[PDB]
Symmetry: C2
Subunit: 121 residues, 2 copies
Amino acid sequence: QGQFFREIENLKEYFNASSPDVAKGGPLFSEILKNWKDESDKKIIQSQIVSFYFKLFENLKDNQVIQRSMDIIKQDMFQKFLNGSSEKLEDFKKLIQIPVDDLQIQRKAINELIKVMNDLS
Amino acid sequence: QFFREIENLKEYFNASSPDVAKGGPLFSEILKNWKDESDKKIIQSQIVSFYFKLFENLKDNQVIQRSMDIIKQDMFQKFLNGSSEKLEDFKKLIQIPVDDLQIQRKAINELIKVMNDLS
């Protein structure tokens, strides 16, 4: 709560994210978060939002100034969204990192479509 | 028709090849891990967005274009309950780049709201 606020401020500082030039261009996630506030299937949307932050942080991994801020925020997302389950986290990380432009991966995906479709229905 | 369509896609990509076995399964293991998980939509969300992104990346193979359209439409009906508002939101989220500074600032600026929603 106090370590978490400090960290978000640290990131806002680094990016210069508390300035008015930011609101310029419409919301990113805030509107969608309202649309699904009370939806029983909101995890569908939260999953995309959380994966976005993981990917963002992953690719800002070498900025020493914000490294720990990202580690703290990530750990928190992990606890709240993935119930601190380390097996769930490994799965989540594997899925978000899959490329769509790799042929070997495209074949596997097509190859597993029957199983995917059954899980959805 | 989607079943016959998956087989069409499997035929095109020559999915029965032993090459495809290399490196293990992509989603099948994960699907098992979460079969009875009350929060499985977290994982299905990532699997469905992968297919949606893949189908856009394959829009150049004209012969399989209708198979992909049929499969995609079916995922839309079953996973997003055919809700067109949900589809617009989902599509918007899966297309967000992580290398655009303007978007990064927006995301950092909305982090408190995101974190509150994860409650």
